[PDB]
């Protein structure tokens, strides 16, 4: 069970940083087939199979990872440019994002930025965004963002996990709030 997480996140690296790196190449979509992960994540782990990867995939908490037939993607996260089919979330009226404490004076100044990934990334849920942004450094800091603000400037928010979103940016006058 705690294999699992090892190879989950050697997928997250394939699929959202360098493909390139294994010699895979995935189309504009993001898209790679199942039988090219495999074998890159074999040249690693070699106990993994197929199956292994199809029950990753079905099991994952967040919906990290897509299945198209034979193919699979990650579904948000990337730091290459792809051309994602989401849905857009029109209803959330807050979002929120946790980032350290020591962020916080240059994203009052310039806002949420995209920094290393294609999408800034926030959350419906609160403690999904305290978690990640805990990733970072011990004080983290709750950003509540008003989703209409964003919809009015253009930014259009979209849904891509169970409660990650994505959005181009996010102006500093559209975080009413940090905790
Ligand atoms: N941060 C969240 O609340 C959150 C929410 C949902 C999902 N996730 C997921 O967690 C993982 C990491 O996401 P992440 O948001 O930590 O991003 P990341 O790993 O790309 O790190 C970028 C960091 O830069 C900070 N930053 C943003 N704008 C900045 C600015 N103008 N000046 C200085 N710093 C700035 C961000 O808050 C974040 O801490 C990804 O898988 C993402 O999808 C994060």
Known sequence: KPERKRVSKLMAYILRHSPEEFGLRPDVEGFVSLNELVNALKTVYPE????????????????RYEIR???????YGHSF???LDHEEDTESRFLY??????????????????????????????????????????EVVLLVIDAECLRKRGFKIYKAGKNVRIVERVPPDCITLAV
Do not use: C, W
Request: proline letters at 7%.
């Open 48 to 63: 993994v199979t197929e199956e292994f990867v199809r029950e990753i995939v079905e099991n994952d908490p967040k919906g």
């Open 69 to 75: 037939g034979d193919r699979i993607r990650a579904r």
């Open 81 to 83: 440019p792809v051309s």
């Open 97 to 138: 994002h946790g980032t350290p404490r020591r962020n916080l004076p240059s994203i009052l100044k310039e806002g949420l930025k995209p920094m290393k990934r294609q999408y800034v990334h926030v959350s419906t849920d609160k403690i999904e965004a305290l978690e990640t942004g805990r990733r970072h450094g011990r």
